[PDB]
């Protein structure tokens, strides 16, 4: 028996001498104090930050802009900032979003760099100036059997700052939609007895968050006008649910609440003398309508500039007046298209196939130097791989094509 | 015509013929019979003569004397330990009972005290010509096996691999285990590693380690180092380390083993290994032809001297293996065998020449010391070879790290 | 219904030993006969089920300052129970165990498992998970004892199946199937095998 | 003085007998698209187009500023294109004898220009691309400078010419071009040469440099690694000196001096000799009734480091001195392999020929064996006499692990600085084509 | 969290934690004792070559037939103590429990040997049948335990049993083989001048011999052992003096 | 001192703690990439064994050792727990250390620091010096000694590794499986000191 109260007390001194111990050498080899976290910045712009966690969390807090896209997924690569002190060794998974040749200046990722000590941070050409506005529906108009535009209005007279072919973040709440509340007209709808559609409903329990390319051009003052295509469900399994968010844009009209965020882009165009070439297919329209705008009405300079759009048949394509009035006034600018299916009641008289192909065997087939011209695309992903490939057995290097998927 | 046949049946083996799953071995014969016509077409528009044909064939060439003398010491001893033993109508039933003894008769030699040369060898091929055949073929099939499945061309350097197992086994090894040892030591030790130059162990020593761990009743003791049905009797390295040079007796001849002797190869023990004179002959060639490392040889030797010198300075008047000098560590065992051909094999060395001289010292130093201080094992020359391809890649390592600290300094 | 997805995942397809690599030292020791792995086997079940009830069932209330104190506390208890236990009925086996037994504490798989799934799940699903790993690690460990102990010993569970020469029979036992070296090469091979017929396990050429 | 000790002087037959002699009439001249490297044309020409001497062809994309100019006056008529449309050559054919003029200058002004102006007219000219930098052999920026300027006054390749005979002729020439390069450079200029005397510069910066052993004595790669060893942020620039005679005609007289002294040398060559020819010149008709019957290869350089010139890339090449031309091994011997070769050239001495000194060799162009892995019999510590690791270099190149060949030191090195290796090799590998992989991958990831 | 709470959390978990564990840790004791102590009583019951299985058989034969003494090694006569719990392989390391045996004493290489050691005789009502004497000795790989079973004559053995060894299963472990161990029976342990008699005698013995038996096939360094094992523990520092005793009288 | 030696030189060949003795082959298969990694690993391994050992020592000596706290009483069943819990205020002490304000060497170790306490090397050195009953500077001795074989076995298995840079490994072998017959080779080759008894 005695044994027994003697390892009782035995095992209970031994582990608390250890947890002792451990506690007071805590004490001592840790800090706990408080740093500011240094920005590029003006000497009250720091934010005070108790040491401990991930960079971007105190950005975060603080309400800065901090970059980040596709809501994260620890696969995005956008949440690189650049620290000159105190930016510690690189994470090795960083190296798959940072190059050996931008590491060398500082680059960091936000998500990775912890929060250890006091660091300087160079944001990125003042970050700063992003904003987020309250905003109200002018217009959700369809298009085509899947892709419809939305019309947004800025408060206050505001215009947002940006430049053609960018973006903006979307985000909604918890909400539930079912396909019949859309008001799509026949002549769209009757094309969707493939799945059935309308026995189709969405809904989510927590705020999401996506982003979408801007369809109009700088000098298109006051709005904000996207292309947005119905996500539906993959042929191979169409049992699982719609896009969560492209349903919920789908169902709103005029006069409905909406909000607007984080004005971005890296698709901007190079500022040369040589020829432009702008290739897409379905909803890409919409930075390639940004582009030829912006270049023809603002730029004004005389370039040379072409347009290839593929579709799946006739009653797919729009923007047929906006881009025909930019041909009739500029000489500089020409518009083509092809089907890859022409229906009975489309009457199709141009080219057929893919649209690569049919660029290739009639444009590029003949160029005196195709490696000269900037090649701008977005669109379909079997379009996204041979026109690339296309291009590519052209000799055209990778600085003159420029690629803006709809993130993978 | 040979040539004509050989290129009029190419058809065959090309891409939806009829046999287009055996183009390796098609391809195999085909270039061994003839080179392959073949032109540089890139840039260094003119290249060596050597190849791995010829770098491998001077080496098998290199072990000739050491295999025909080891035949004839073993068709030798193995008559005399017969003669020792047996007599008259005792001997007769023996002979008549044992396939290599009565096919030696059939054949024209005698089994008698008073054979020739012609006998002895006779006899010696009869126990290594079986086993050489049998390693040869199983390893073949797994080479050839793996070169086919991935599609690869099938290559040399299992034409030594095969020889050289052969030679460093007993007289009487059963031939399923020499099948097994050259199953292991091929496919685990070489082939899984992607082949010939992407190891980094030594195939031969490797088989010959799994028969030493898996069967090592027929390996070792008295039993099986003399071709002599019935005959137990120790070898010198043994004998030694019983009762220091005194006890270096030939108990079939009740004669003095000699240093002369010893080196010579009047001895008995593995196939090919007895003839430090043969082995320094053939390995002379090699040496000479810059195929094997002189660097690697002199750092084996002078870890042998140093340690074995270090031994006898300090002494024991218990252990008789301290006093045994290192003219005598040279002769004995499969001392010269295996820092002659196995401790040069160029894939398991050391790739630096700073790296070869510390490579071959670990070889001799551990040699050395199991030989002395292991009571278990009688010889360590392949368990010195084993260790050392371990740390090989260190030696490497740090030579170019110094290297690599001079060129930061702008020096290099 | 997860059940029987749960326990039986990591046998195949996110095996402990030969996926992750957790659990290789007793593998490499225990293996040479099927009652010592079999015993090892029922003891690693026993052990990470219950400290995986137990870590999930007081994760909310753990100090984080040392919650590897209280773990390996936990652990440490349940092993040395353990220990109490084959000593009074299992001596044989316990003897030949020896250190092994101890070393539970120290065998990755059940930390790993407490680290990983306890520390975020419920009671009842950590001791479904800490069940499967040990399937998944019984699986391994008794495929490597049956053709070490059969091709060393003749024998299975102590039964003769292949008469040794020594015994008056035919085979002759292969001595290295008695040291450790045997176990790498078995357990490369069944490696081999299972990324043989799982190919999505295949590691990325570097 | 600095002696090599570990090379191998090729005992190739045919040496050109050391004479200076005019050489066939050139019709055709071209520049080779694919011999610069990192370069992305931009043509300023198309078939038909009528050209002046040192008129510019193309610009660079990735180099921007850099010009390529005209050998001669005459008529493009053809631009060839390979896969994916990558430019093969631009040739043109000669007539008239029309020009672009520069600036020119005495004697006694060249060492104190300024760096601006002598670049400005480098540049113009297209004499600019005459130089090459260490690291990754490529034209230098037109706005960067280097703190030295190597000079290659000497040749050791098999069959070259002798640089003293031709430097001879251009006493001038080459010590107002040495003045030149001495006003062009930041540092120091090294003018690297045997143990013959040259025309000297007076520059207290320009220095002389004696080499002596055999190959590769004379490569500006091992000139850099004994006298300015280069890294990422220590380049080099390196030339010849025949380019150095161009920059100093260009330099006193105003015009872009296009003239060669190559040497034609091999085996199938009837009479080898030392030939005036032009930049650019057609090797299928320079070496017209030059060499004997049968099929041979021709190539523009070296038989260690040069390009075979059929088709679109047959004329010469811009960093090439010679013309080598041997045979094309395609026999099959019976057992050749176990043979115990007299005439056959081998580092090891596993053959008969060793034992023959002197002795001299028809070699042609066959594999001696089929490719294998490698076997490190040690043959590439015996030919490279740089303090380097040559064994696991080698191996890190063909395992493609550029990140640790850069600290073995590949960014010291070029395609000709492991041509011996890849001579010397059991496994018949190609070094030249891994440590470009390897340099295109470290060229490109910063 | 706070440290009052850290330490609370602590303290219950290392209660609730000991108390089972030293509860299992001291219920057990008695049956791991009970496990141990039948280990060895199986073994020399099989020794003395009386048929047993299972506990309760085990426990009660070694009990009525079995009977353990203390012998003192320098005297060679009994000595008064607890020979049923004597640990000799602990008193042996022992300072004061033991002496250091010298070089030409130590043929045996066990460097130490206990002062008293114990010996199990065999009963018949109250007659003494056999004596079992363990002994010990170093082979190639291991230390080599043994009993051997010596008639009441002091010459003659009964039979061998190796209990604890490791040497290799095929070449050295062959000192459990039953074949092997059948030859002892009948072997006079001493000869006519009353010294030290065991021969392994290499290659075999001369079938009829009364003092050599077959050396182990292939493995010396352990026939070595044993024969060193056996010279060492027949003599003067062994059970000499005792055996001299049991054969002038006594038991 | 000759003693001394002895024990060191047997600690650190003759019984490798991870080639002879086969303990700590999770992180001893896993981490063997890279040479330095691997020394950096190896020499962690060495101060936590050489700081952990002597301790455990002292603890047993004075407090589980039978009757050493009170006569008829031992504490033997609570050896386990003991040792873990030394074993990891040790380790987390030196994290504390490393991550820490004294040398941010921390970094390139990353995930394995946690993983040193559930290294059955050091659990397996502390249990054999407490059957091996070792005085105080015999302790310290093995527990250096475990540690730089270890260090030294884990060194050398990274330099193979690297050597196999050149290999063709068959897809499904490469990996574990590969390194798992990488390391019985290792241990074939390391049977050559089986025999001696230092
Ligand atoms: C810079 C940028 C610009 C963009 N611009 C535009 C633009 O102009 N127009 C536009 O329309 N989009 C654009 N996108 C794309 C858009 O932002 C989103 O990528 C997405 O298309 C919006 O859909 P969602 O978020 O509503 O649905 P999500 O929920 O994001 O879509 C999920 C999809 O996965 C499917 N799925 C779910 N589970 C399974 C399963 N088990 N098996 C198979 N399938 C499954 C669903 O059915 C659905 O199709 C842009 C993206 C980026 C990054
Ligand atoms: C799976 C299909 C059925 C199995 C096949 C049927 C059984 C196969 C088995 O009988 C062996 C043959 C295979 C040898 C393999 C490899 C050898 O290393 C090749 C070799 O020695 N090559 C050469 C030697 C020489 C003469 C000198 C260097 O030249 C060479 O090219
Ligand atoms: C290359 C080679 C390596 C050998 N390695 C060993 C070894 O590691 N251990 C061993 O016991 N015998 C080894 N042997 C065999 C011995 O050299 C010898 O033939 C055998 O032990 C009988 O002779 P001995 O007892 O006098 O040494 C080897 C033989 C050769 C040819
Ligand atoms: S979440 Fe965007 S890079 Fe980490
Ligand atoms: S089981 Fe992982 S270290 Fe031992
Ligand atoms: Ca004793």
Not at chain 1, 257 to 278: L, Q, R
Request: glycine share 10%; proline share 4%.
């Amino acid at each position: 028996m005695s044994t027994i109260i003697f390892g009782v007390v035995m095992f209970t001194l031994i582990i608390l001498a250890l947890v002792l111990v451990i506690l007071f050498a805590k004490s001592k080899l840790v800090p706990t104090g408080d740093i500011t976290i240094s920005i590029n910045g003006d000497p009250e712009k720091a934010i005070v930050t108790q040491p401990g966690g991930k960079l971007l969390t105190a950005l975060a807090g603080a309400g800065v802009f901090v970059s980040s896209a596709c809501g994260g997924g620890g696969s995005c690569g956008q949440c690189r900032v650049k620290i000159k002190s105190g930016g510690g060794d690189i994470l090795p998974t960083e190296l798959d979003h940072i190059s050996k040749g931008e590491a060398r200046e500082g680059e960091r990722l936000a998500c990775q760099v912890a929060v250890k000590a006091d660091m300087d941070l160079e944001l990125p050409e003042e970050i700063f100036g992003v904003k987020k506005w309250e905003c109200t529906v002018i217009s959700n108009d369809n298009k085509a059997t899947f892709i419809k535009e939305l019309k947004l209005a800025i408060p206050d007279g505001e215009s947002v700052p940006f430049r053609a072919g960018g973006y903006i973040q979307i985000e909604a709440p918890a909400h539930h939609v079912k396909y019949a509340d859309f008001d799509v007209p026949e002549k769209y709808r009757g094309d969707w007895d493939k799945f059935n559609l309308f026995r189709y409903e969405s809904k989510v329990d927590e705020p999401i968050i996506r982003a979408y390319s801007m369809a109009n051009y700088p000098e298109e003052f006051g709005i904000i006008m996207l292309n947005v295509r119905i996500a539906t469900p993959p042929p191979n399994n169409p049992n699982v649910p719609p896009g969560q968010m492209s349903s919920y844009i789908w169902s709103l009209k005029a006069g409905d609440k909406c909000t607007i965020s984080g004005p971005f882009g890296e698709f901007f165009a190079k500022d040369t003398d040589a020829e432009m070439v702008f290739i897409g297919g379905g909803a890409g329209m919409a930075p390639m309508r940004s582009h030829i705008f912006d270049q023809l009405k603002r730029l004004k300079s005389k370039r040379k500039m072409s347009y290839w759009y593929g579709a799946r048949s006739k009653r797919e394509m729009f923007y047929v007046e906006d881009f025909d009035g930019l041909a009739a006034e500029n000489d500089n600018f020409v518009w083509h298209c092809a089907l890859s299916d022409p229906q009975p009641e489309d009457n199709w008289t141009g080219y057929t196939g893919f649209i690569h192909n049919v660029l290739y065997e009639n444009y590029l087939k003949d160029h005196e130097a195709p490696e000269d011209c900037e090649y701008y695309m977005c669109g379909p992903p079997m379009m996204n791989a041979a026109v690339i490939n296309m291009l590519k057995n052209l000799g055209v290097e990778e600085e003159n094509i420029l690629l803006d998927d709809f993130g993978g | 015509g040979l040539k004509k046949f050989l290129e009029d049946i190419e058809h065959h083996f090309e891409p939806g013929g009829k046999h287009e799953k055996w183009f390796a071995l098609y391809e195999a014969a085909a270039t061994l019979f003839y080179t392959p016509g073949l032109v540089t077409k890139r840039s260094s528009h003119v290249r060596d003569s050597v190849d791995l044909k010829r770098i491998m064939i001077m080496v098998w060439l290199a072990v000739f004397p050491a295999m025909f003398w080891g035949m004839y010491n073993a068709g030798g001893q193995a008559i005399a330990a017969l003669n020792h033993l047996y007599s008259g109508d005792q001997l007769a039933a023996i002979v008549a009972g044992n396939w290599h003894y009565w096919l030696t008769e059939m054949l024209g030699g005698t089994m008698s005290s008073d054979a020739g040369w012609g006998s002895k060898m006779l006899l010696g091929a009869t126990y290594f010509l079986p086993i050489y055949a049998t390693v040869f073929i199983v390893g073949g099939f797994w080479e050839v096996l793996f070169c086919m499945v991935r599609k690869h061309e099938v290559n040399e350097g299992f034409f030594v691999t095969s020889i050289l197992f052969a030679l460093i086994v007993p007289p009487t090894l059963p031939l399923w285990q020499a099948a097994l040892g050259i199953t292991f030591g091929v496919v685990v030790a070489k082939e899984v590693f992607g082949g010939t130059g992407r190891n980094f162990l030594n195939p031969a020593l490797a088989g010959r380690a799994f028969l030493f761990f898996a069967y090592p009743a027929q390996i070792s003791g008295d039993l099986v180092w003399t071709a002599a049905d019935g005959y137990s009797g120790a070898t010198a390295l043994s004998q030694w380390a019983q009762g220091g040079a005194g006890a270096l007796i030939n108990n079939a001849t009740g004669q003095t083993i000699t240093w002369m002797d010893a080196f010579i190869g009047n001895i008995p023990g593995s196939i090919g290994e007895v003839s430090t004179l043969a082995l320094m002959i053939g390995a002379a060639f090699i040496v000479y032809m810059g195929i094997a490392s002189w660097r690697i040889i002199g750092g084996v030797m002078i870890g042998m001297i140093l340690l074995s010198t270090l031994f006898n300075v300090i002494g024991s008047d218990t252990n008789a293996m301290f006093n045994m000098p290192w003219h005598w560590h040279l002769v004995l065992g499969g001392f010269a065998f295996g820092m002659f051909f196995m401790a040069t094999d160029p894939v398991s060395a050391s790739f630096t020449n700073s790296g070869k001289w510390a490579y071959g010292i670990l070889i001799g130093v551990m040699c050395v010391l199991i030989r002395v201080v292991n009571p278990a094992y009688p010889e360590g020359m392949m368990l010195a070879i084993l260790f050392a391809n371990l740390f090989a890649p260190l030696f490497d390592h740090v030579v170019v790290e110094r290297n690599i600290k001079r060129r930061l300094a702008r020096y290099g | 219904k997860e059940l029987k997805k749960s326990v039986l995942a990591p046998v195949l397809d996110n095996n402990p030993i030969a996926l992750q690599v957790l659990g290789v030292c007793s593998a490499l020791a225990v293996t040479t006969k099927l009652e010592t792995a079999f015993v090892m086997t029922l003891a690693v079940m026993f052990v990470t089920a219950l400290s995986n009830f137990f870590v999930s069932l007081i994760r909310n209330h753990i100090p984080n300052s040392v919650r590897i104190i209280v773990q390996m506390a936990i652990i440490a208890s349940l092993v040395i129970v353990v220990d109490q236990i084959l000593k009074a009925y299992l001596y044989d086996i316990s003897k030949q165990l020896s250190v092994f037994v101890g070393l539970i504490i120290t065998n990755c798989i059940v930390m790993g498992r407490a680290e990983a799934f306890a520390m975020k799940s419920e009671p009842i699903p950590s001791f479904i998970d800490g069940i499967g790993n040990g399937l998944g690690y019984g699986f391994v460990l008794m495929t490597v004892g049956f053709f070490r102990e059969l091709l060393g010993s003749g024998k299975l569970f102590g039964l003769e199946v292949l008469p040794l020469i020594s015994n008056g029979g035919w085979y002759q036992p292969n001595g290295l199937m008695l040291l450790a070296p045997s176990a790498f090469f078995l357990i490369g091979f069944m490696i081999w095998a299972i990324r043989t017929f799982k190919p999505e396990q295949v590691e990325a050429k570097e | 003085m600095i002696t090599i000790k570990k090379g191998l002087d090729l005992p190739i037959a045919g040496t050109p007998s050391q004479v200076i002699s005019d050489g066939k009439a050139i019709k055709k001249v071209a520049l080779l698209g694919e011999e610069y490297v990192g370069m992305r044309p931009t043509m300023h020409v198309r078939v038909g187009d009528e050209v002046k001497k040192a008129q510019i062809l193309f610009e660079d994309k990735k180099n921007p500023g850099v010009k390529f100019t005209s050998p001669v006056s005459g008529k493009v008529v053809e631009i060839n294109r390979g896969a994916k449309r990558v430019l093969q050559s631009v040739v043109i054919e000669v007539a008239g004898d029309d020009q672009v003029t520069f600036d020119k200058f005495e004697a006694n002004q060249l060492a104190s220009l300024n760096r601006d102006a002598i670049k400005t007219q480098l540049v113009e000219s297209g004499l600019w691309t005459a130089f090459r930098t260490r690291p990754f052999s490529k034209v230098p920026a037109i706005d960067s400078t280097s703190e030295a300027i190597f000079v290659t006054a000497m040749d050791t390749n098999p069959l070259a010419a002798e640089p003293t005979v031709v430097i001879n002729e251009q006493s001038e020439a080459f010590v107002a071009g040495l003045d030149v390069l001495s006003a062009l450079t930041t540092g120091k200029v090294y003018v690297c040469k045997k143990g013959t005397s040259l025309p000297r510069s007076q520059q207290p910066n320009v220095e002389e440099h004696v080499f002596d052993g055999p190959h590769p004595a004379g490569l500006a790669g091992t000139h850099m690694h004994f006298l300015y060893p280069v890294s990422a942020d220590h380049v080099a620039w390196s030339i010849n000196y025949q380019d150095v005679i161009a920059v100093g005609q260009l330099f006193l007289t105003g015009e872009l001096y296009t003239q060669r002294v190559v040497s034609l040398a091999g085996p199938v060559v009837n009479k080898p000799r030392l030939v005036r020819t032009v930049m650019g010149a057609s090797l299928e008709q320079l070496v017209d009734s030059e060499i004997m019957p049968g099929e041979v290869r021709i190539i523009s350089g070296s038989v260690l480091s040069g390009t075979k010139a059929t088709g679109p890339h047959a004329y010469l090449g811009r960093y090439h001195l010679q013309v080598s031309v041997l045979r094309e091994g395609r026999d099959k011997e019976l057992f050749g392999w176990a043979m115990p070769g007299k005439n056959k050239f081998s580092v090891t001495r596993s053959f008969l020929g060793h034992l023959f000194k002197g002795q001299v060799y028809n070699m042609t162009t066959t594999t001696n064996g089929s490719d294998r892995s490698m076997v490190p019999i040690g043959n590439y510590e015996k030919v490279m006499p740089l303090d380097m690791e040559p064994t696991l270099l080698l191996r890190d190149l063909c395992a493609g692990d550029s990140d640790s060949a850069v600290r073995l030191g590949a960014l010291e090195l070029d395609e000709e600085d492991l041509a011996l290796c890849t001579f010397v090799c059991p496994g018949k590998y190609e070094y030249g084509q891994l440590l470009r992989e390897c340099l295109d991958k470290i060229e490109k990831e910063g | 969290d706070s440290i009052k709470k850290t330490l609370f959390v602590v303290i219950a978990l290392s209660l609730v934690c000991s108390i089972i564990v030293s509860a299992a840790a001291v219920g057990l004791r008695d049956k791991q004792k009970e496990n141990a102590a039948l280990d060895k009583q199986s073994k020399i019951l099989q020794v003395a070559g009386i048929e047993a299985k299972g506990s309760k058989q085990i426990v009660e034969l070694f009990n009525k037939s079995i009977e353990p003494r203390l012998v003192d090694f320098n005297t060679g006569d009994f000595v008064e103590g607890d020979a049923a719990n004597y640990d000799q392989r602990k008193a042996a390391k022992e300072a004061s429990e033991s002496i250091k045996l010298t070089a030409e004493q130590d043929k045996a290489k066990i460097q130490r040997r206990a002062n008293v050691g114990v010996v199990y005789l065999v009963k018949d009502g109250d007659k003494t049948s056999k004596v079992i004497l363990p002994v010990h000795g170093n082979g190639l790989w291991s230390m080599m335990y043994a009993f051997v079973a010596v008639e009441t004559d002091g010459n003659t053995v009964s039979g061998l049993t190796y209990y604890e060894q490791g040497e290799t299963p095929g070449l050295g472990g062959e000192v459990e083989n039953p074949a092997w161990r059948a030859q002892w029976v009948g072997k006079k342990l001493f000869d006519e001048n009353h010294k030290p008699a065991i021969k392994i005698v290499k290659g075999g013995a001369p079938q009829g011999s009364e003092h050599g038996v077959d050396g182990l096939s292939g493995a010396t360094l352990t026939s070595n052992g044993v024969q060193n094992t056996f010279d060492f523990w027949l003599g003067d520092m062994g059970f000499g003096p005792f055996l001299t005793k049991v054969r002038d009288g006594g038991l | 001192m000759e003693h001394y030696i002895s024990l060191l030189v047997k600690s650190i060949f003759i019984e490798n703690m991870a080639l002879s003795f086969f303990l700590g082959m999770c992180t001893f298969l896993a981490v063997s990439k890279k040479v330095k990694t691997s020394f950096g690993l190896g020499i962690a391994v060495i101060v936590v064994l050489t700081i952990s050992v002597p301790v455990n020592n002292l603890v047993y000596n004075l407090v589980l050792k039978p009757d050493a706290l009170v006569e008829g009483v031992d504490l033997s069943f609570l050896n386990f727990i003991t040792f873990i819990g030394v074993i990891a205020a040790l380790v987390q002490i030196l994290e504390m250390i490393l991550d820490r304000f004294f040398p941010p060497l921390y970094n390139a170790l990353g995930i394995f620091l946690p993983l040193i306490t559930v290294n059955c090397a050091i659990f397996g050195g502390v249990s054999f010096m407490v059957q091996r009953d070792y005085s105080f500077a015999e302790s310290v001795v093995y527990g250096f000694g475990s540690g730089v074989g270890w260090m030294l076995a884990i060194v050398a298995l990274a330099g193979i590794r690297e050597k196999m840079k050149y290999s063709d490994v068959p897809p499904g072998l490469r990996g574990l499986g590969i390194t798992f017959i990488t390391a019985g080779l290792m241990a074939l080759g390391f049977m050559s000191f089986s025999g001696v008894q230092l």
